[PDB]
């Protein structure tokens, strides 16, 4: 999943009076200040893009409100139950939160209400054999050996498309069964021919 | 600290380095990392797929001998958690074990911790894949005995087809 991940927070140390209300600064300024140590709990191997430059933006408002957005490509775990395969559907999570700060230190909240706080681009669909029916946004707590952490979760609900497997396996199997059943219409004295029917259909089904 | 049987590992770096430093008033440091590591596990496949495998992670100190650093599993057997939540599709974790010892090299003696898992392979996939087609083809090979001796073309075709199917099954197995 490719995302613009936007965070925002208040820092009273960075309030200022100046000609403009908002300083749209270089991403270099982000490293010089505190930022949340957000990480994805179920992420496997993610990329923070830095082509040509670090794909980040930092904006400081006069009141001390900071906006900080990043461009990320997250490869996240989506465990599946394949008993209904290829007619199965899954709810792939995307869970994130602070790595080091517990509930008493840092708390995450959705900017808008959770339904509108996660937006998917209309043209942004790279799925081949799945339909993204929608998403559900929620939040919860996780208890670990180091304390309690707020975990903000989205669940993308995907339904597999059966057409590929219909072409791939079901139709060959159906016509193989029909091919085997064709042998019933040959006369019983065509022993080599009917044996050829049976053995070739068995080999095809095995393959 | 380093993992001796490592092959390729990295600390997760999104959104930042998944790393934690926590100090306490008495000078106690807690240092956490989120690490994905590919560790070598040499498997004896003589009983494959009805086999059990030992896979271990060997935590060790590189530059500091036992005179400098002393490792231990804090909490004892409760040091390692989350094994119960692992659900592999092909394996089941029979048990896990923690060991603490010392390893001697030419440069000195070093502390070693070992986290080992015993994995039992699931047989259902192989039953669906290899065993049952082989049994079915062997059963089909006996159909020739119910055909007359003079139907040479039919009986030879059936036998040759069964042999060919067995060869294809073996081929598709060995390719993976």
């Amino acid at each position: 999943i490719d995302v613009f991940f936007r965070q925002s927070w208040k820092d009273e140390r960075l309030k200022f009076k100046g000609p403009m209300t908002v300083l749209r600064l270089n991403n270099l300024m982000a490293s010089k200040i505190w930022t949340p140590d957000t990480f994805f709990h179920n992420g496997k191997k993610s990329v923070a893009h830095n082509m040509t430059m670090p794909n980040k933006l930092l904006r400081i408002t006069e009141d001390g409100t900071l906006l900080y957005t990043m461009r990320l490509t997250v490869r996240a775990e989506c465990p599946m139950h394949l008993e209904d395969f290829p007619m199965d559907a899954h709810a792939c999570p995307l869970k994130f939160g602070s790595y080091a700060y517990t509930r008493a230190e840092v708390v995450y909240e959705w900017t808008r209400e959770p339904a509108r706080s996660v937006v998917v681009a209309e043209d942004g669909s790279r799925l081949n054999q799945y339909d993204l029916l929608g998403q559900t946004v929620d939040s919860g707590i996780v208890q670990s050996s180091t304390g309690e952490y707020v975990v903000m979760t989205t669940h993308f609900h995907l339904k597999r498309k059966i057409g590929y497997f219909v072409i791939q396996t079901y139709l060959p199997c159906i016509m193989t069964v029909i091919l085997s059943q064709v042998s019933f219409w040959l006369n019983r004295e065509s022993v080599p021919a009917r044996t050829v029917f049976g053995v070739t259909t068995v080999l095809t089904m095995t393959t | 600290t380093y993992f001796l049987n490592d092959k390729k590992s990295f600390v997760h770096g999104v959104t930042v380095k998944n790393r934690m430093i926590r100090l306490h008033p008495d000078g106690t440091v807690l240092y956490g990392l989120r690490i994905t590591t590919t560790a070598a596990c040499m498997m004896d496949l003589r009983r494959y797929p009805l086999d059990e495998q030992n896979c271990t992670l060997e935590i060790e100190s590189y530059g500091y001998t036992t005179d400098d650093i002393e490792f231990y599993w804090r909490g004892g057997d409760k040091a390692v958690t989350g094994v119960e939540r692992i659900e592999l599709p092909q394996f089941s974790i029979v048990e896990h074990r923690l060991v603490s010892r010392n390893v001697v090299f030419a440069t000195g003696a070093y502390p070693r911790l070992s986290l080992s898992f015993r994995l039992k392979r699931n047989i259902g996939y192989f039953i669906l894949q290899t065993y049952m087609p082989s049994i079915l083809i062997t059963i089909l090979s006996w159909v020739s005995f119910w055909i007359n001796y003079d139907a040479s073309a039919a009986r030879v075709a059936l036998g040759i087809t069964t042999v060919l199917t067995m060869t294809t099954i073996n081929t598709h197995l060995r390719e993976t």
Partner: nanobody
Amino acid sequence: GSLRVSCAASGRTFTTYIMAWFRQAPGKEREFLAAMDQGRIQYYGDSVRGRFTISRDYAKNSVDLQLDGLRPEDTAVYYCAAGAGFWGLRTASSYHYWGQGTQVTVSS
């Protein structure tokens, strides 16, 4: 008043499923109390946030709910459920496996 309602699963390992607790009062519709995921992440309803605590024993394949600060309106039938959380984690329709239900009553 304090209580602990436990739920034990049989015939299927729910290590990779979400296990949840629901509540149904007389006349009212079934509502979501709590849920816990394979990642040990806990979701709670607004009505019972901070009071009820959900936990899971993955070795025993069970989900427990500790109830504290009971009130008269907590009287209801409490249901254990297991599911994949499709379209859900809060909708009863997403859970395929359901327990028989346990009555709970609070008397002042």
